[PDB]
Amino acid sequence: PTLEWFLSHCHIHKYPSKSTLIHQGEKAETLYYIVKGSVAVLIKDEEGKEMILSYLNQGDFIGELGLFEEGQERSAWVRAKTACEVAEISYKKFRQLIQVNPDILMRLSAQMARRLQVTSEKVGNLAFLDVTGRIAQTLLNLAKQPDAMTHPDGMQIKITRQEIGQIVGCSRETVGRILKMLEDQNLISAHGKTIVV
DNA sequence: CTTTTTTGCCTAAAATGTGATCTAGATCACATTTTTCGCATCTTTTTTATGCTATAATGTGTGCAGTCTGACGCGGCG
Numbered sequence: 001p002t003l004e005w006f007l008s009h010c011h012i013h014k015y016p017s018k019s020t021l022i023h024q025g026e027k028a029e030t031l032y033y034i035v036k037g038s039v040a041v042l043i044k045d046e047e048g049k050e051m052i053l054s055y056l057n058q059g060d061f062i063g064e065l066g067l068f069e070e071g072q073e074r075s076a077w078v079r080a081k082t083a084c085e086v087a088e089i090s091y092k093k094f095r096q097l098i099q100v101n102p103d104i105l106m107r108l109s110a111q112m113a114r115r116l117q118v119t120s121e122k123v124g125n126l127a128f129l130d131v132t133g134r135i136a137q138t139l140l141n142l143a144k145q146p147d148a149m150t151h152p153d154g155m156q157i158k159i160t161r162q163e164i165g166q167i168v169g170c171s172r173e174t175v176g177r178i179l180k181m182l183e184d185q186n187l188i189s190a191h192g193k194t195i196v197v
Numbered sequence: 198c199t200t201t202t203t204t205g206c207c208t209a210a211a212a213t214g215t216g217a218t219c220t221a222g223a224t225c226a227c228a229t230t231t232t233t234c235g236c237a238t239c240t241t242t243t244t245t246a247t248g249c250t251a252t253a254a255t256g257t258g259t260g261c262a263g264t265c266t267g268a269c270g271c272g273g274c275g
């Protein structure tokens with residue numbers, strides 16, 4: 001596709017785990033785009049505690065909020081989770097490509113709109129539902145993510161307990177307490193990895 | 198005999214589990230200021246019921262029918 005063309009003019013960089021791509025406050029001039037790898041986007045306080053806004057999978061764009069307003073600062077940290085294959089594109093050259101071909105936006109707008117779908121749902125559940133429904137509707141959809149293994153009447157996920165406190169942004173010990181109370185609910189069959197029946 | 202692949206160890210190391218102990222949150226039945234609403238005033242404002250005008254003026258038709266007609270009633274009509 002366009003991928004290999006653009007790869008000829010190689011901006012594609014390969015980053016290992018945890019090399020910091022984005023600090024916030026940086027200058028916004030370069031779009032990236034993903035070939036391969038997984039990455040977490042996150043934010044923290046002046047006094048240190050950090051928050052994972054989300055994570056992102058292959059095929060998606062980075063940093064898109066900057067192109068519109070010339071000279072913005074980068075909004076959040078985006079810290080490599082694993083080995084990443086990463087495009088890099090200038091806002092100038094990106095606008096050029098916009099004047100060349102906008103059908104790319106046909107695909108792009110869709111994932112953006114469902115980002116709204118999920119972010120509204122984020123703030124909504126933050127308001128309406130306690131930790132119960134919080135991690136309930138976490139694992140219910142964790143049962144649906146590819147890398148999910150089948151459990152005959154159920155589903156298996158082995159993401160054991162560290163990524164979870166990040167994908168929801170919570171303590172793991174409290175996740176413990178209530179995993180065991182959901183085990184008490186006959187909801188979850190879990191021993192590290194969990195069997196969403 | 199050499200390679201690589203595996204496991205277990207070294208060696209460094211994150212994630213799990215103690216529950217005891219508060220602490221900001223949210224409830225919760227009942228008094229007060231605001232909306233601007235509804236009917237009585239004004240209060241105009243328009244509109245409406247009523248009232249005069251002193252040279253002089255004296256019997257319609259008014260626009261039509263085109264007239265159906267056969268039988269029977271009924272008042273005449275002798």
Ligand SMILES: Nc1ncnc2c1ncn2[C@@H]1O[C@@H]2COP(=O)(O)O[C@H]2[C@H]1O
Pocket residue numbers: 022028041053054061062063064065066073074075076077078115119
């Ligand atoms: N709620 C979100 N969902 C998905 N991606 C996000 C979200 N918030 C921020 N990002 C991405 O993280 C990037 C951080 O810097 P930018 O604002 O330049 O562009 C941002 C988006 O690409």
